[PDB]
Design an enzyme around this catalytic site. Structure first.
Site, PDB file in Angstrom:
ATOM      1  N   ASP A  35      38.485  33.152  39.007  1.00 39.74           N
ATOM      2  CA  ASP A  35      39.466  33.841  39.868  1.00 39.74           C
ATOM      3  C   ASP A  35      40.701  33.284  39.933  1.00 39.74           C
ATOM      4  O   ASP A  35      40.722  32.026  40.729  1.00 39.74           O
ATOM      5  CB  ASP A  35      38.981  34.060  41.400  1.00 39.74           C
ATOM      6  N   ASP A 224      46.329  37.453  37.998  1.00 38.84           N
ATOM      7  CA  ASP A 224      45.216  37.475  38.835  1.00 38.84           C
ATOM      8  C   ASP A 224      43.883  37.763  38.062  1.00 38.84           C
ATOM      9  O   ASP A 224      43.664  39.259  37.927  1.00 38.84           O
ATOM     10  CB  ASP A 224      45.169  38.069  40.046  1.00 38.84           C
TER      11      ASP A 224
HETATM   12  C1  LIG Z   1      41.147  35.100  50.189  1.00 44.59           C
HETATM   13  C2  LIG Z   1      39.663  35.818  50.099  1.00 44.59           C
HETATM   14  N1  LIG Z   1      39.517  36.149  48.757  1.00 44.59           N
HETATM   15  C3  LIG Z   1      39.655  37.333  48.138  1.00 44.59           C
HETATM   16  C4  LIG Z   1      39.176  37.211  46.705  1.00 44.59           C
HETATM   17  C5  LIG Z   1      39.519  38.110  45.706  1.00 44.59           C
HETATM   18  C6  LIG Z   1      37.956  38.718  45.272  1.00 44.59           C
HETATM   19  C7  LIG Z   1      37.010  38.697  46.110  1.00 44.59           C
HETATM   20  C8  LIG Z   1      35.665  39.413  45.878  1.00 44.59           C
HETATM   21  C9  LIG Z   1      35.777  40.008  44.772  1.00 44.59           C
HETATM   22  C10 LIG Z   1      36.670  40.171  43.680  1.00 44.59           C
HETATM   23  C11 LIG Z   1      36.641  41.009  42.527  1.00 44.59           C
HETATM   24  C12 LIG Z   1      37.106  40.610  41.403  1.00 44.59           C
HETATM   25  N2  LIG Z   1      36.843  41.323  40.187  1.00 44.59           N
HETATM   26  C13 LIG Z   1      36.599  42.669  40.643  1.00 44.59           C
HETATM   27  N3  LIG Z   1      36.241  43.112  41.553  1.00 44.59           N
HETATM   28  C14 LIG Z   1      36.228  42.596  42.572  1.00 44.59           C
HETATM   29  C15 LIG Z   1      37.921  39.453  44.146  1.00 44.59           C
HETATM   30  N4  LIG Z   1      40.025  37.475  44.477  1.00 44.59           N
HETATM   31  C16 LIG Z   1      41.094  38.132  44.075  1.00 44.59           C
HETATM   32  N5  LIG Z   1      41.973  37.496  43.520  1.00 44.59           N
HETATM   33  N6  LIG Z   1      41.408  39.302  44.963  1.00 44.59           N
HETATM   34  C17 LIG Z   1      42.393  39.965  44.848  1.00 44.59           C
HETATM   35  C18 LIG Z   1      40.439  39.294  45.689  1.00 44.59           C
HETATM   36  O1  LIG Z   1      40.475  40.068  46.684  1.00 44.59           O
HETATM   37  C19 LIG Z   1      38.604  35.819  46.760  1.00 44.59           C
HETATM   38  N7  LIG Z   1      38.809  35.391  47.992  1.00 44.59           N
END
Ligand SMILES: CCn1cc([C@]2(c3cccc(-c4cncnc4)c3)N=C(N)N(C)C2=O)cn1
EC number: 3.4.23.46
Length: 369
Positions: A35, A224
């Site tokens: 991520d 991202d």
């Molecule tokens: C700060 C809280 N957080 C949010 C995330 C997430 C996150 C969290 C959980 C799952 C996903 C996700 C990634 N791929 C596909 N389906 C879901 C993304 N990471 C990103 N970049 N995005 C925008 C988020 O929403 C991580 N931590």
């Protein structure tokens, strides 16, 4: 050892890409979401209906508690847990082991996904956006500090009754030249928090959307891997879809489709790709008045579900170049030189008429928030 890193990512379409990691001693295996849009190393550490395994601190002889909680509420969902450090490796990544900060998620809401097959997240963005604050060293920062791996990694996301599985590679510490063709063009990282960049122009089928470029980055633009879609500021989004609706006018769809919450189907290789236009994002170059474009095909922004969902959607938090943009390309997160490189991916999906492309320079004679 880059050969051994190739194809070290897996995932289900729309559910993120993950790499295998081990935490603790003896090694506990977990699949972890790559991520670039967050900065915590956070892993399920308690039972959850969507988790089939999780990090058990008490089984680890090298776990150290930091006696500190962390609460991460966010727009969509929430997680919460306990800070510690433990030994971490990536079996199919650099051959090293580092002691990293770990957020052990004890409670969460709408954070894990049913069937995604990952158990935690490897936030690869910078300390500035880490929780609870920028004092909690992110994984990649610890890796570089503790080992000799160069301050750079690269992502080649390849995409695709059961959700399509996707593959890709995370190459840490260098650039694998077999992963891309042609040239790598670099765009500056405007600021080290998200991987923030500047978009200077966008065209749908060669047609300039003709907006003040500040709209492209309102209130920011980020790369991202943790977002599936290309997400666009409201005003840019509307102009984008209108332009796209026009280019595919022959044959119509319900606006539930355009709202990216309603799939559309053809049957076996009948998909009219040629109907939909290419989209070019022009990113600021390393030289002030230069830019370069990444051009992405409908094959990227119509995500398979032969059924597809519209993978461009509206944003109130600025532009997000998520997986569907990255999938056309080999993307270098050159943190050492504060820049992000784009090249045509060796694995990108294209017909015999069009192809994802990375081309420059374009000279444009003020675009950031
Ligand atoms: C700060 C809280 N957080 C949010 C995330 C997430 C996150 C969290 C959980 C799952 C996903 C996700 C990634 N791929 C596909 N389906 C879901 C993304 N990471 C990103 N970049 N995005 C925008 C988020 O929403 C991580 N931590």
């Amino acid at each position: 050892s880059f050969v051994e890193m190739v194809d070290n990512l897996r995932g289900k379409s729309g559910q993120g890409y993950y790499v295998e990691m081990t935490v603790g001693s003896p090694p506990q295996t977990l699949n972890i979401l790559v991520d670039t849009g967050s900065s915590n190393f956070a892993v399920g550490a308690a039972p959850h209906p969507f988790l089939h395994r999780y990090y058990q601190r008490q089984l680890s002889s090298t776990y150290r508690d930091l006696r500190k909680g962390v609460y991460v509420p966010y727009t969509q969902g929430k997680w919460e847990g306990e800070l510690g450090t433990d030994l971490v490796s990536i079996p199919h990544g650099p051959n090293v082991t580092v002691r990293a900060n770990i957020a052990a998620i004890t409670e969460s809401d709408k954070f894990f996904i049913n069937g995604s097959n990952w158990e935690g997240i490897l936030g690869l963005a910078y300390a500035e956006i880490a929780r609870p604050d920028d004092s909690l060293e992110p994984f990649f920062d610890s890796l570089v500090k503790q080992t000799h791996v160069p301050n750079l990694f690269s992502l080649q996301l390849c995409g695709a009754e059961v959700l399509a599985s996707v593959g890709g590679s995370m190459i840490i510490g260098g650039i694998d030249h077999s992963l891309y063709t042609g040239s790598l063009w670099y765009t500056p990282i405007r600021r080290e928090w998200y991987y923030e960049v500047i978009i200077v122009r966008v065209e749908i089928n060669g047609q300039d959307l003709k907006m003040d470029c500040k709209e492209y980055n309102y209130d920011k633009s980020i790369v991202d891997s943790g977002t599936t879609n290309l997400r666009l500021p409201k005003k840019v989004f509307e102009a984008a879809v209108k332009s796209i609706k026009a280019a595919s006018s022959t044959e119509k769809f319900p606006d539930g489709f355009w709202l990216g919450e309603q799939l559309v189907c053809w049957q076996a290789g009948t998909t009219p790709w040629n109907i939909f236009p290419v989209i070019s994002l022009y990113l600021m170059g390393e030289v002030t008045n230069q830019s370069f474009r990444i051009t992405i095909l409908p094959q990227q922004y119509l995500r398979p579900v032969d059924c597809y969902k519209f993978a461009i959607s509206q944003s109130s938090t600025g532009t997000v170049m998520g997986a569907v943009i990255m999938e056309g390309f080999y993307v270098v997160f050159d943190r050492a030189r504060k820049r992000i490189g784009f090249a045509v991916s060796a694995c990108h999906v294209h017909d015999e008429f069009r192809t994802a492309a990375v081309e420059g320079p374009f000279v444009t004679l003020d675009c950031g928030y």
